[PDB]
DNA sequence: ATTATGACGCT
DNA sequence: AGCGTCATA
């Protein structure tokens, strides 16, 4: 009664920006906009890989992980932009200082922790305390939420989707209590309001439209900023959460999507997030682990406790590059050529890393992949990294992975190696 | 022959 | 430390 905590403590936003590498690209190229685009990587085999896919395009059936050449097939009018390619390799740079226009622009709202290119997690819980206290007991008018959706409204006793957007608003709206600074639905409508300050800003800013989530707190802002994508936001409610559980497939929720989601569904029996309420922590706790279910058993009840974490900056920087096929690198020069090409990329993202952000970087991972080996990564293997030097750090590389060659004469590599990666970890402040 | 990343958890 | 899992353009 007075005593189970439901996780309405915090206000947690999650920005993620629409079809961000095209929007990007977009901006760039003004013949790109309002079409069906797509930007892709690499060109000979198949056309290229597509990364990112326009709402347009999406239409056609287009989606990222498709040959360009496939896509093709299903909208012979797309349009393409290409990665650009800087000493043998894709080069992401574009698209890393694209996040970070938008990322600070984020963080004159609040601390943010960055968690990809082109999205970020917000707490904005001492934000809505104070929006609350100018407030005043002012109940919060419809004009000031224009872009969101109020998560299963409406509801009860129009064709349009504006006008449903509206109405849902206008039901949660009604039954707010204004007069209650501490209610948490209150408080995520303030949240609301400051997230559409936020998303405008982004836009008027950057050019880029983005989508957003409103809930209580990480998992569930993700959750909610997919529902109504693109360029809207939307607030998921403590009290939505039963009703959009019980047909909520498991993977959708953010770290189900793989082995551990597919177990839930095997050794339980069930589909849905909602179904999970009926097992007792011990019980999750039995087959998944006595963290993961605890996190299920809180999670099916829309309560979560994972912070919002104080980090705008990656705390690594790598470079990697495959050589599938028949590309495979066979040869000592070969494997050197490459990672010295890495490894300048590395240099000048990490010069420039250390200029922006007084920090440098201390330890060297270097990671391969052999030919005929199922997983991503093959070896792992680190080393110091004492100075920004491109010639070093290949040479050091070569250094780590001189003995995976099995070949009896030292020109030749062998078995033959399908990925290389160097990553710069481990930063300390300068 | 989706590729190029990046964070977190386990032992 | 090195490996595995999960995630995102
Ligand atoms: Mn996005
Ligand atoms: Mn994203
Ligand atoms: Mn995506």
């Not at 498709?66 to 909208?75: F, T």
């Not at 409610?237 to 770290?255: A, C, E, N, T, W």
């Not at 030292?410 to 078995?415: D, F, G, H, I």
Request: glycine share 6%.
């Amino acid at each position: 009664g007075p005593h189970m905590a439901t996780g309405q403590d915090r206000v947690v936003a999650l920005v993620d920006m629409d079809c961000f590498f095209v929007q990007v690209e977009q901006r760039q190229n003004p013949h790109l906009r309002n079409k069906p685009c797509a930007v892709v990587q690499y060109k000979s085999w198949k056309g290229g890989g597509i990364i990112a896919v326009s709402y347009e395009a999406r239409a056609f059936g287009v989606t990222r992980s498709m040959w360009a050449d496939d896509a093709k097939k299903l909208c012979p009018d797309l349009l393409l932009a290409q990665v650009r390619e800087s000493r043998g390799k894709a080069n992401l740079t574009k698209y890393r200082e694209a996040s970070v226009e938008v990322m600070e622009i984020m963080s004159r709202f609040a601390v943010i922790e960055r968690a990809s290119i082109d999205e970020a997690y917000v707490d904005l819980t001492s934000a809505v305390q104070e929006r609350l206290q100018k407030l005043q007991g002012q109940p919060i008018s419809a004009d000031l939420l224009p872009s969101t959706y109020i998560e299963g409204l409406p509801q009860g006793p129009t064709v349009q989707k504006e006008g449903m957007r509206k109405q849902g608003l206008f039901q949660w709206l009604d039954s707010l209590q204004i007069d209650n600074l501490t209610s948490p639905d209150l408080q995520l409508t303030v949240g609301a309001v400051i997230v559409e300050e936020m998303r405008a800003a982004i836009e008027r800013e950057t050019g880029f439209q983005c989508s957003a989530g409103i809930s209580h707190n990480k998992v569930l802002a993700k959750l909610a900023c997919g529902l109504n994508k693109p360029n809207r936001q939307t607030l998921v409610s403590h009290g939505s959460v039963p009703q959009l559980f019980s047909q909520m497939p498991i993977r959708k929720i953010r770290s189900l999507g793989g082995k551990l989601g597919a177990s839930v569904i095997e050794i339980l029996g069930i589909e849905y997030m909602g179904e999970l309420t009926q097992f007792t922590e011990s019980q999750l706790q039995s087959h998944f682990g006595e963290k993961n279910g605890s996190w299920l058993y809180a999670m099916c009840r829309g309560i979560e406790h994972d912070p919002v974490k104080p980090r705008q900056l990656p705390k690594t920087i790598g470079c990697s590059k495959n050589f599938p096929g028949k590309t495979a690198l066979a040869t000592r020069e070969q494997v050197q050529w490459w990672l010295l090409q890495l490894a300048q990329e590395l240099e000048e993202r990490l010069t420039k890393d250390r200029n922006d952000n007084d920090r440098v970087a201390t330890q060297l991972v270097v990671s391969i992949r052999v030919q005929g080996d199922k997983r991503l990564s093959s070896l792992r293997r680190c080393c110091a990294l004492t100075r920004y030097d491109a010639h070093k750090m290949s040479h050091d590389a070569f250094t780590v992975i001189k003995n995976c060659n099995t070949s009896g004469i030292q020109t030749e590599w062998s078995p033959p190696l399908t990925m290389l990666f160097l990553c710069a970890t481990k930063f300390s402040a300068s």
